[PDB]
Amino acid sequence: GVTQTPRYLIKTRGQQVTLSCSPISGHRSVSWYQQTPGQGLQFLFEYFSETQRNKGNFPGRFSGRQFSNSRSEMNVSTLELGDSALYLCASSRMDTQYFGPGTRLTVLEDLKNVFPPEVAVFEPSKAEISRTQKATLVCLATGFYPPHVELSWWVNGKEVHDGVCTDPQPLKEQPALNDSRYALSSRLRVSATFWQDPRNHFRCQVQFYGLSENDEWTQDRAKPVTQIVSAEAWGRAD
Amino acid sequence: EVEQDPGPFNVPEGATVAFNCTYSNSASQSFFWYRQDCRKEPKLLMSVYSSGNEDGRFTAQLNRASQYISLLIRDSKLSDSATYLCVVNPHARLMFGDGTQLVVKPNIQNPDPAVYQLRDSKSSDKFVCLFTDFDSQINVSQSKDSDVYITDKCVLDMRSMDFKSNSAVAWSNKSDFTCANAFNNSIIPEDT
């Protein structure tokens, strides 16, 4: 499909950033769009045959490039807090424009507030098992910032999608704070016969996106790099 | 530019939904409806022609002189819940509208509301309260105390048994917290 790298990024105001997008094989046209929660999709630039074809009325700090392999890169210099947005790439043969996952860019004044989540799973109650013949595990991630994590359920070492529901919107822990940390919850429901088997293993995995070894850290706490925080539970007869 | 309904739309499952969109450039060669999930990217849903278009439960209408374009969803399902984007293609640059969010409430077959306590598996007192199996009409209000947290309703679909259930999670660091005082606005759950 359409590749976009990196997937997530954190940066301070005034830095330069470089996003890259590989189109579908055989697609020559590559277009960039910006998506802010306050605004909608806004065109940035389209590229065909290494040339900027159409501009989108964006400041020149939003640079763009394209190479002979139809891969396209775009830079954002002099980063500002209002640049925090999803930068989508779209490919086309040149009529249908296929979008990539997008690059999530967060701009901050402080690197100080980036925190990894704490994860915990909570075992199904016996009352639900008795009256519904079903068992709901509940995963909870707390205290992370910026609110950009990916939650997944792994049963016996294999990821599962059926029987899963995660919150679309992370919860603000202290809504009044402008620098509040976030929380997220998810549910995995199975039959009571499944949970009662003690050889079954359940795990909630929370991929948090933070810094990297490129970034500098000068705080008491460990550097909150991108990481995987997990919690687990075993099946219980009763 | 492109103007469409602010939304959100909130409709029962199986309801017919209509989407409304207007635009300035009447000569644009192509018109599209795109779909977008919350944590995802736009995806083409249907092309729209002057004769309209039809694809399963989706239909679309276009009137260039009136600058009008419409989408119609029949027998709306939970999977249809998403933001629908009206897209115009004057030369090659897609112009998206702000989009209209659509939420489809599942019809709970056998409601059995209850608030259960779920213990932490890492040998601790920590617990969460699961409000579950309630009908889709009741609205889970957000917490009114600073240190209790209540998630918005999440609709779970166990396709293996063709089963669907609403759920909301509550938890607090307060030591006065109990599962029987965590939620507000319920029906008659089994508050064991």
Ligand SMILES: *[C@@H]1O[C@H](CO)[C@@H](O)[C@H](O)[C@H]1NC(C)=O
């Ligand atoms: C639909 O659009 C027309 C014009 O485009 C407008 O007059 C009408 O109020 C709209 N209806 C809704 C429900 O948005």
